[PDB]
Design a protein around this ligand. Sequence first.
Ligand SMILES: NC[C@H]1OCCc2sccc21
Length: 288
Amino acid sequence: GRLIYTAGGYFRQSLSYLEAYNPSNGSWLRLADLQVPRSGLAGCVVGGLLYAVGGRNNSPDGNTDSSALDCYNPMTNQWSPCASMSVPRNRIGVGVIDGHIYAVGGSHGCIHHSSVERYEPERDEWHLVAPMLTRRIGVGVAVLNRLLYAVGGFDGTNRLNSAECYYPERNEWRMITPMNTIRSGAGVCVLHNCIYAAGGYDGQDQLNSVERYDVETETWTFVAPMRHHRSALGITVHQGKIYVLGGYDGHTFLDSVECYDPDSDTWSEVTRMTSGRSGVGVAVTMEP
Ligand SMILES: NC[C@H]1OCCc2sccc21
């Protein structure tokens, strides 16, 4: 696409912001608010539409986990409700395969889901698929070569370095090599033939380390760390570079946005969000 969209998030309470950053000229645009504030959601794009999935509304008047799927049309600058998921999913992970949205894990109250469901936009309907081998919230999800990966998270008792892969034509999950680091709330994305896991929380500290999984070799290698420790960051890829947005570093809710160039193996600060926040949903699509 052309713009990096950031939806929702958390600072003092769950947020309704939708803002779009243009890497070509550095500018931010504030767009139509989410109908309901939410943090811990995931974002994704299918057919030029932006989707906001799951999350939780942490508010003065209570706290409600979200089963909502909401669609944003850049041409109209309007959000529309879509079919809700079977269950609320806070700290959700999402990935897209063949035009379908997979919702992975997350929490509802003290329930930590291992369940997974798939949304088909052409039918506006959700269907459950095979559950993961492990309950995971704060799970990172990415897609490579039509396979879905769930990385890290928290199972209700332990934070995880484990990861697993979903094979759609077998409707089956299999464990892959665990990361070298325990990470909850890491940013997970795909670049070239590798799954990247950036930042997160290991139980004691927020992380700046970054490692990547080569699917051919089945090994995790550390790359250069980010300039700022952060968990509950947003992540996306734009023209071959990784962008990480916001997060929580144990002291401050970050407005920092960093950009990773895999050819130089370096991170640089590229912009700041209009305000610090964590738990945003991020995706890339056309200009509104
Ligand atoms: N570790 C990040 C964490 O910070 C406190 C509030 C929220 S909402 C989503 C994630 C988070």
